[PDB]
Design a protein around this ligand. Structure first.
Ligand SMILES: N[C@@H](CCC(=O)N[C@@H](CSCc1ccccc1I)C(=O)NCC(=O)O)C(=O)O
Ligand SMILES: N[C@@H](CCC(=O)N[C@@H](CSCc1ccccc1I)C(=O)NCC(=O)O)C(=O)O
Lengths: 217, 217
């Protein structure tokens, strides 16, 4: 059963929770609360590069969010069925992570800038990302971005869209395909559960998480 | 023959040049010089996400540096021989790209901060990265990080180390394994050529490149 090392909050680890959950995998979490716990982790050489996320799985201690995500995907049929697919999924995912980053950085912005930022996510989403996906979907009519099966691309996208909606609730207004897609995906049982109460899905970060992260790093 | 879209300079594209070169692949380049050329590129829908790098290869227009690198690696035996390997290479690479980023951002810093920054790269390299690799190498005695064959991890690492050395010439002083490794790698013929004159290898960015990039973005 995988073990997740990270502070108790979303940050960069959330994607990993999403994927694991979606793949139907149960896992554990070991929260960081202080510099010191981080040191111990570091000290025992558990963090290849001294950072988290780190996830212990299949006897390894993987680090680097993307690397971790690829591993899981590949262990769980979330990476396509061939190079072509794999290639698409990869790109989609990277592009998406670039959008998600805005959300990740958000809480650490200066309150003043926080607002300008939301506007920016809105614009990027609307203009740079949503349209690509909307068209993809519109173009093949399937419920998945790639290969008519769930992929890592769909989870990250789903994760991101929902996160955005938390700040800009109507962000999908003009993306009817994306709206439907979201809906369905969210009805996938593992996902449906993850979205339900008592999942390891984390809440949007608060003043505390923020404080804490600062305290550990 | 691949076609590289990017300004005429290193930026994020350099890794791609390195890999292609190393893999012995010849390619072309289409330089961006103005906002306008970027617009046209964008306008014709050639940039999946409206950004570069974009590389046209095997009939696709790939975007996202990492995604691009994985594609090439996978088309050229630079991604290991199995999941285990692939997994290592992946991590190494991501960690390395995190270091390289410092170099990428450098020129756009405020001159004052530029210096503090160099010191920082030095420290990170010394403390967080070099040691991992040095030990890996020291631990198996091979000339490659993984699988006793060239991998994407070795190229990125090589690229990075050399770039650092351009600013901190003795950065490898305490990494005798890394020094040797570097030397040998640099003697790989494709690499040896890339390093020689008349390669598509780019120079460290100047006031111009800097200016230009700003002008296009
Ligand atoms: N590229 C890596 C980077 C991971 C990383 O940056 N980890 C940091 C925390 S990022 C905190 C952060 C930073 C910027 C924005 C959001 C967030 I959350 C860490 O473990 N640092 C330990 C150390 O350096 O001692 C990844 O995606 O896994
Ligand atoms: N994660 C992507 C991002 C690529 C990217 O940021 N591309 C930018 C230039 S980065 C410029 C930059 C920015 C920060 C530091 C170094 C560098 I070079 C682009 O095409 N922008 C076009 C647009 O947005 O209109 C990658 O690695 O491919």
């Amino acid at each position: 059963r995988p073990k997740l090392h990270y502070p108790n909050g979303r940050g960069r680890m959330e994607s990993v929770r999403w994927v694991l959950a979606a793949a139907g995998v149960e896992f554990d979490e070991e929260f960081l609360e202080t510099k010191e716990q981080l040191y111990k982790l570091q000290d025992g050489n558990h963090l290849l590069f001294q950072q988290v996320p780190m996830v212990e799985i299949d006897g390894m201690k993987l680090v680097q969010t993307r690397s971790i995500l690829h591993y899981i995907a590949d262990k769980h049929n979330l990476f396509g069925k061939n190079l072509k697919e794999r290639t698409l999924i990869d790109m989609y995912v990277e592009g998406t992570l670039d959008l998600l980053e805005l959300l990740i950085m958000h809480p650490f912005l200066k309150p003043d800038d926080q607002q300008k930022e939301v506007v920016n996510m809105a614009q990027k989403a609307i203009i740079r990302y949503f349209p690509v996906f909307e068209k993809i979907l519109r173009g093949h009519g399937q419920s998945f971005l790639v290969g008519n099966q769930l992929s890592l691309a769909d989870v990250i996208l789903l994760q991101t869209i929902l996160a955005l909606e938390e700040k800009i609730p109507n962000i999908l207004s003009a993306f009817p395909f994306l709206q439907e897609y979201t809906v369905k995906l969210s009805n996938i049982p593992t996902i449906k559960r993850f979205l339900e109460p008592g999942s390891k899905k984390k809440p949007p970060p608060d003043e505390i998480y923020v404080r804490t992260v600062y305290n550990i790093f």
